[PDB]
Design a binder for this molecule. Structure first.
Ligand SMILES: Cn1sc(=O)c2cc(S(N)(=O)=O)ccc21
Ligand SMILES: [Zn+2]
Length: 258
């Protein structure tokens, strides 16, 4: 049947319906800190989330997304390795079934408990659907989560999970400020990649931050209580919704720090 993270439809099977799975700029990848090149011509990142407007939280069967109003330049990302402005459309996570796995990208082979992806699309393309047809159409900001102290800004997200337990369920989620999900430092690694789930479009400039955020065990735990399945179907916990690291190939991971 269709893709998932199961034994019979997981990442190793994706290439059959989506041949781009074995492409040249596939994500995620392993970030080798010692092999990454320090680039001083990289400008700092500019995250402007002060006018961010969250509208809804949804369980799409693969993860839960928090969508934002992208009808205007409310929550934008610019600078760094980017040209022009990028609108935040939505954010989601990738987590594991154990605290030692869940992230997609790895640092020196190290996996984190989960990984946050704040998806943005280039405004010079008018809409998201047009941006996913360009090599510089998207910019995803990736943040790692490690278990430790609880992250206050994440709790509002965690409390709403009960109402979007099964595939297809959604719920109003207004007034969520994405700024409480940012680590103190904006140091990052940048490289050209792609979406990590089908259709696996190589339209992404990946911006992975060096500094991870801490989330309590109890917070990550509630993520694992979500279901892949729709209501009325056999229960399949939403765990391990992460894709293995892919071959870097003819690519270079640049760093904005040394
Ligand atoms: C189908 N859509 S819409 C969107 O914003 C998005 C993002 C990613 S990710 N895990 O590579 O960021 C994967 C798929 C996807
Ligand atoms: Zn993702």
């Amino acid at each position: 049947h269709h893709w998932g993270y199961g034994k019979h439809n997981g990442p190793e099977h994706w290439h059959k319906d989506f041949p781009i799975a074995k492409g040249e700029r596939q994500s995620p990848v392993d970030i080798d800190t010692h092999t990454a090149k320090y680039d001083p011509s990289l400008k700092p990142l500019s995250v402007s989330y002060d006018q961010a407007t969250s509208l809804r939280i949804l369980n799409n069967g693969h993860a839960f997304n928090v969508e934002f109003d992208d009808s205007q330049d409310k929550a934008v990302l610019k600078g760094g390795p980017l040209d022009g402005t990028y609108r935040l459309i939505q954010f989601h996570f990738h987590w594991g079934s154990l605290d030692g796995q869940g992230s997609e990208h790895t640092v020196d082979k190290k996996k984190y408990a989960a990984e946050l992806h704040l998806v943005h699309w280039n405004t010079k393309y008018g809409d998201f659907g047009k941006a996913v047809q360009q090599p510089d159409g998207l910019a995803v900001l990736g943040i790692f989560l490690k278990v430790g102290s609880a992250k206050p800004g994440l709790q509002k997200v965690v409390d709403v999970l009960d109402s979007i337990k099964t595939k297809g369920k959604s719920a109003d989620f207004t007034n969520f400020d994405p700024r409480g999900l940012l680590p103190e430092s904006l140091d990052y690694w940048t490289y050209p990649g792609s979406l990590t789930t089908p259709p696996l479009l190589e339209c992404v400039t990946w911006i992975v931050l060096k500094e991870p955020i801490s989330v309590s065990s109890e917070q990550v735990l509630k993520f694992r209580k979500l279901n892949f399945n729709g209501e009325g179907e056999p229960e399949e916990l939403m765990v391990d919704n992460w894709r293995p690291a892919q071959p870097l190939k003819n690519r270079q991971i640049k760093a904005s720090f040394k």
